[PDB]
Amino acid sequence: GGMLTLIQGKKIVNHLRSRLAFEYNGQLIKILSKNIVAVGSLRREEKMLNDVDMLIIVPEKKLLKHVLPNIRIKGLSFSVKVCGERKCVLFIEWEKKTYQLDLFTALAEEKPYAIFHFTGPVSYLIRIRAALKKKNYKLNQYGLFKNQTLVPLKITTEKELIKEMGFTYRIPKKRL
DNA sequence: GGACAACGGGACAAC
DNA sequence: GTTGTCC
DNA sequence: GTTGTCC
């Protein structure tokens, strides 16, 4: 896929926000825009993008079988590259040129951890996880674990989560 | 003596 | 750093 | 990769 200016990327996301659905036992379920979070370099406001990234919050676990494996896009032609229950990669045709689209899934109780994970950047994410590792924790896109056990942080947002683990909050674009 | 699908360790890849 | 999908 | 199971 080609390179995208930040604003080009914001147009695709805006366009797609009302246009993703999934086929669920024949029926065609539309995905709410309130349940889509733009992530990746887009969310970090980088000048140029290699991917458009969209994290989908799925309401109930039983749907992971159905959302990305049956994902559908109103209007737009595209091909599937790789796809599964938690990561789908699509090459969308958009104005006589093709770009790469990464859809990811998180459940509701994983939401902050997933936005944290997928917002990146990779450098920022490694150095944080290295420090928690040294304190015998593990952090991924689903939770914080100690002794192979979820740590039930009483948090809801990314901002709260970041601070609850012992880090200051930075807007997405100042993460490094 | 070629043409499939099932399996899964490791390549590649998502941030 | 940690996990996902592929053949 | 490898084995299986058809032709």
Name the closest residue (CA) to the C1' of nucleotide C6: A82
Distance CA(A100)–CA(A116), nearest Å, equals 21
Same domain, A17 and A91: yes
Give me the A residues in range 77-106 that sit within 7 A (CB) of strand C. Answer: 82-87
Protein CA at A170 to nucleotide C1' at D6, angstroms: 61
Protein CA at A140 to nucleotide C1' at B11, angstroms: 22
Same domain, A103 and A71: yes
Q: Nearest CA to A2 among A137, A64, A75, A95? A: A95
Q: Which nucleotide is nearest to A126 (CA to C1')?
A: C1
Same domain, A51 and A114: no
Alpha-carbon distances of A124 from A3, A111, A114, A119, A153, rounded to whole Å? 23, 19, 15, 10, 21
Query: At how many Å resolution was this determined?
Result: 2.2
Is strand C in 7 Å reach of the CB of A19? no
Q: Which nucleotide is nearest to A120 (CA to C1')?
A: B15
Residue A7 makes CB contacts below 8 A (sequence gap 6+) with none
Same domain, A136 and A69: no
- How many domains would you assign to chain A? 2
A105 touches A64 (CB < 8 A): yes
The amino acid at A58: V
Q: Which nucleotide is nearest to A82 (CA to C1')?
A: C5
Alpha-carbon distances of A28 from A44, A72, A169, rounded to whole Å? 32, 9, 39
A69 touches A84 (CB < 8 A): yes
Same domain, A62 and A115: no
Give me the A residues in range 16-45 that sit within 7 A (CB) of strand B. Answer: 39-41
Q: Which technique was used to obtain these atomic coordinates?
A: X-ray
A30 three-class SS: strand
Exposure on the CB side of residue A122, measured as CA atoms within 13 A: 0
- What is the 8-class DSSP label of residue A8? H
Q: The domain that contains A112 carries what CATH number?
A: 3.30.210.10
Q: Which of A81, A107, A133 is a domain's end point?
A: A107
Same domain, A126 and A41: no
Same domain, A76 and A121: no
Is strand C in 7 Å reach of the CB of A138? yes
A87 touches A67 (CB < 8 A): no
